[PDB]
Amino acid sequence: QVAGLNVNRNPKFWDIESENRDRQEEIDKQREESRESRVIKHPFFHNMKSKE
Protein backbone atom coordinates (compact mmCIF):
# COMPACT_ATOMS: atom_id res chain seq x y z
CA GLN A 1 0.00 0.00 0.00
CA VAL A 2 1.95 2.98 -1.37
CA ALA A 3 -0.32 4.93 -3.75
CA GLY A 4 -3.12 5.09 -1.21
CA LEU A 5 -4.53 8.27 -2.72
CA ASN A 6 -7.56 7.97 -5.01
CA VAL A 7 -6.42 10.72 -7.39
CA ASN A 8 -7.87 10.16 -10.87
CA ARG A 9 -4.91 9.40 -13.16
CA ASN A 10 -6.82 9.65 -16.44
CA PRO A 11 -4.29 10.40 -19.23
CA LYS A 12 -6.64 13.03 -20.68
CA PHE A 13 -6.32 15.15 -17.52
CA TRP A 14 -3.28 13.55 -15.83
CA ASP A 15 0.25 13.58 -17.27
CA ILE A 16 1.21 10.01 -16.45
CA GLU A 17 4.30 10.20 -18.66
CA SER A 18 5.78 13.15 -16.75
CA GLU A 19 5.25 11.46 -13.37
CA ASN A 20 6.78 8.23 -14.68
CA ARG A 21 9.80 10.08 -16.11
CA ASP A 22 10.33 11.90 -12.81
CA ARG A 23 10.03 8.51 -11.11
CA GLN A 24 12.90 6.96 -13.06
CA GLU A 25 14.82 10.22 -12.54
CA GLU A 26 14.53 9.91 -8.76
CA ILE A 27 15.17 6.15 -8.87
CA ASP A 28 18.39 6.72 -10.84
CA LYS A 29 19.29 9.39 -8.29
CA GLN A 30 18.80 6.73 -5.60
CA ARG A 31 21.04 4.34 -7.55
CA GLU A 32 23.76 7.01 -7.58
CA GLU A 33 26.45 6.49 -4.93
CA SER A 34 30.02 7.53 -4.14
CA ARG A 35 33.38 5.78 -4.35
CA GLU A 36 36.89 6.61 -3.14
CA SER A 37 40.46 5.41 -3.64
CA ARG A 38 42.22 2.62 -1.75
CA VAL A 39 45.44 3.08 0.25
CA ILE A 40 47.72 0.10 0.91
CA LYS A 41 51.07 0.04 2.73
CA HIS A 42 53.50 -2.29 0.95
CA PRO A 43 57.04 -1.77 -0.42
CA PHE A 44 56.04 -2.92 -3.92
CA PHE A 45 52.58 -1.30 -3.93
CA HIS A 46 52.12 1.81 -6.06
CA ASN A 47 48.90 3.70 -6.83
CA MET A 48 49.28 3.73 -10.61
CA LYS A 49 47.14 3.04 -13.65
CA SER A 50 47.73 0.07 -15.95
CA LYS A 51 49.65 2.25 -18.42
CA GLU A 52 51.27 4.10 -15.52
13 in contact with other proteins (CB under 8 A): no
Give, in order, the Cα–Cα distances in Å from 29 to each of 14, 17, 20, 22, 32.
24, 18, 14, 10, 5
CB of 44 to other proteins, least distance (A): 6
CB of 39 to other proteins, least distance (A): 8
Is the Cβ of residue 8 or residue 50 nearer to other proteins in the bound state?
A: 50
- Please tell me the distance from the alpha carbon of residue 28 to that of residue 26, in angstroms, as a whole number: 5
Query: Which residues here bind other proteins, judged by CB under 8 A?
Result: 39-44
